[PDB]
Amino acid sequence: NKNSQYKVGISETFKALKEYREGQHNDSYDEYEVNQSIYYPNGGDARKFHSNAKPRAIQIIFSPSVNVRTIKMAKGNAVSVPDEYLQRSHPWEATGIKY
Amino acid sequence: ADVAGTSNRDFRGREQRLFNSEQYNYNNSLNGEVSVWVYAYYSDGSVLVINKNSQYKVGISETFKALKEYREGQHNDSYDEYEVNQSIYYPNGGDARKFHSNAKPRAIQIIFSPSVNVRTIKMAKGNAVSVPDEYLQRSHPWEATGIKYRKIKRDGEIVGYSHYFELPHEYNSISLAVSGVHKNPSSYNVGSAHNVMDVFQSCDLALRFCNRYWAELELVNHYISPNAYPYLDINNHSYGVALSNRQ
Amino acid sequence: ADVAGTSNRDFRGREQRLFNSEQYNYNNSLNGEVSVWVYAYYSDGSVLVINKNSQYKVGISETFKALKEYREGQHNDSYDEYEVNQSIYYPNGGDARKFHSNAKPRAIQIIFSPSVNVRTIKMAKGNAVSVPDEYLQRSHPWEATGIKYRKIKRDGEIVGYSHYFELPHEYNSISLAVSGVHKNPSSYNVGSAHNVMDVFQSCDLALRFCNRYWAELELVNHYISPNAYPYLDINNHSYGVALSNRQ
Amino acid sequence: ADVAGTSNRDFRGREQRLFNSEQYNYNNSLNGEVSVWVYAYYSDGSVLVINKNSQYKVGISETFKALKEYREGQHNDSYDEYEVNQSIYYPNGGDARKFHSNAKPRAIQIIFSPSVNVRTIKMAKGNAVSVPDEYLQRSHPWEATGIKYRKIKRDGEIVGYSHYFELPHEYNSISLAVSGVHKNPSSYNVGSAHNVMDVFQSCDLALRFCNRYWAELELVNHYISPNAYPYLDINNHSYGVALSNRQ
Ligand SMILES: [Cl-]
Ligand SMILES: [Cl-]
Ligand SMILES: [Cl-]
């Protein structure tokens, strides 16, 4: 959650959105290897096909004080590029119509 | 139809050249990305990359501690490295069991995308307690280092800009921020009242990436090359893809 | 000699076809195996296979707990998974630190060898405390599910039979047994007094196999294909070897 | 309509009574389940339940070692308990650091469903190396203990059968198997040639359940009561549901 005057946003990497269980085991070495295999195909040496730490869905909610026409989203790939290659990336999409 | 590669009717040929030219030129538009990379090189040959990609302007700011080597899911001497930090912040301030932490970076490479204006680049290279120039009272909060950036070139095209500095001495203990502004040859100020709130949104929409690769070879193979990123390796070899007016 | 592939004197050709036909037909004899496989699919993409191979008849019976994912030589949340079991056996019966155990199977595939009689197949799909139908008092101990089995076919031959069901809901918490009888088109009952003690010995001589593979790809490559086993993958692709009257 | 509870036209009333009667009677049909439970009582007040539910006949067979207390996801003295096993198998055979293992059961309760024929019940209560009666040479492989089974009754109906024996002495070290056959008052032998292969399939289709509950109270609340199972507690109190001709 972020709460601010005038404007507000959240920006998270692939890694930061993965499940983290505070004070429990997290397969932290294997999950480093998972990250390498997500960043580049066959880039890692993980002992699993699918990390259960990967999100299954995202909900974005705005307060009723937002102007919906101003909403912008940068949904990147796992190495934080909006649209396949930086050279051809618009840094956001205006997704207000979908809210 | 005309035969391939013999006439002005090779539309497949003309479209391939336009496809590459449009990518090059879109990146340099005010609609396009500007990107910075900081590479921290460690003595075990591993490399931390921090990347940020944003519209209008972009930067990275890291503390002394955040630039030290961290091996995800391995032992890191985490208690001794707290003590190392205390002895770096103030001479004889700590109780570490080592003279030199191998987690300290041996060098930094800063790379900008070719969409940066080099004259806008600014760097705050601080001491280990995050003061730019010895004491805050006498610190200019940045230096304009653009003149030091080398052109990373492939097939005669600029694919990026590199500033590299080694930290080979025991006293090279740094905090680091770098900043650049997207090219804007127009007289439309992207920060004028009309568009300033879009620049505020760009700060929130900027995407970050960070990862430690085991070797420069793994960085070139699995980070630089697959993403068409510019790079300069220890042997002064340039990587990247030339796009302007090219098939 | 006659030239290869031109006449009825290609004895190498005729023997190759008979070799394959004899394997197909031996399996369908009362001397031959009947085999069942249960595949438990987990959310991490791993697959538990349980196989049993026996003469006359064959089955597998597993508790709720035994079908849960177990990673040999890794951490399994073994204390929390005891608590998960208590909360599955009775609502609010446990003190687990999670809503959904990722060790719960997401789907089950049952496969029989082509030597099964499909009309004999029986399944006991129980609740998590191993009761077939809500309460023992009103439970028929099985359902005859043969009508639901799809033919796994290669080159027009039936190489096996598949029943697949997903468990995608939080309330899909099962115990499982399945049973089938070897084809017997004759009027020699293999369980008649003459041979009944041989069927008792078959129960003791049945060979079991179990293993967790990391991915369906590893299962296809290293389990299904090397052993000439039938299979149906998530993309509805059939695996196995056609043998009847084939080179 | 007629008023509730005043006439022979209370169809809701008649259907409720038939619904319960049909459950009672279905269980006693040859289509119905026969169920056995073994309860192993430990000194810490915990109770291991092993349950098996099958058509035609049912049993449980456990080694000395398998009946010992196992606490999932807690410390179990696993090395010392190996040594305990060696000293139980042969006097002075081990090097344990204790006189009495608190993992040894203090008592056993065997319960059968009311669908059992009590005259068919058989028990093999072995020594710790799984010999029924001192030496194999002189061992009958079972005793017919039906005469010792008490009727578990609720509202005048038999809801189950109980055999209970304490193991309070240091020398009470047992292996255990128990077996019973479903009621069959007909002259249709379910093991005659016509149906014998269905009895073989029943062995494979039998569903098993096992779990350690922390207390008899937790067993009554979360295992016995929710599943409409019969039970007899330490205070000689009967649990279960009367169904025959009852609303
Ligand atoms: Cl523009
Ligand atoms: Cl035969
Ligand atoms: Cl009947």
Numbering used by the authors:
A (entry chain A): 52 to 150
B (entry chain A), C (entry chain A), D (entry chain A): 2 to 248
What do the authors of the reporting publication say about this deposited model?
Here, we have developed a cell-free protein crystallization (CFPC) method, which involves direct protein crystallization using cell-free protein synthesis. We have succeeded in determining crystal structures of two types of proteins with high-resolution using CFPC. The polyhedra crystal (PhC) produced in insect cells by infection of cypovirus (cytoplasmic polyhedrosis virus, CPV) is one of the most highly studied in-cell protein crystals. The structure of crystalline inclusion protein A (CipA), a bacterial in-cell crystal, had not been previously reported.
We have succeeded in crystallization and structure determination of nano-sized polyhedra crystal (PhC) at a high resolution of 1.80 Å. A 20 μL reaction mixture containing 10 μL of WEPRO®7240 and 10 μL of the mRNA solution was overlaid with a 200 μL SUB-AMIX® SGC solution in a 1.5 mL microtube and then incubated at 20 °C for 24 h. The crystals prepared from the CFPC reaction (PhC_CF) have the same cubic morphology as that of PhC synthesized in insect cells (PhC_IC). The average size of PhC_CF (580 nm) is approximately one-fifth of that of PhC_IC (2700 nm) as determined by scanning electron microscopy (SEM). To collect diffraction data from the nano-sized PhC_CFs, the crystals isolated from the reaction mixture were diffracted using the micro-X-ray beam of the BL32XU beamline equipped with Serial Synchrotron Rotation Crystallography (SS-ROX) at SPring-8. The root mean square deviation (RMSD) value of the Cα atoms for the structure from PhC_IC is 0.09 Å. The main difference between PhC_CF20°C/24h and PhC_IC is that PhC_CF20°C/24h shows no electron density of nucleotide triphosphates (NTPs) bound to the monomer interface, which are observed in PhC_IC. The average B-factor values per residues of all atoms in PhC_CF20°C/24h show a large value for His76 because of the lack of cytosine triphosphate (CTP) interacting with His76 in PhC_IC. In PhC_IC, the amino acid residues surrounding guanine triphosphate (GTP) and adenosine triphosphate (ATP) interact with the NTPs, but in PhC_CF20°C/24h, which lacks these electron densities, there is no significant difference in the side chain conformation between PhC_CF20°C/24h and PhC_IC. These results indicate that the NTP binding is not essential for the crystallization of PhM.
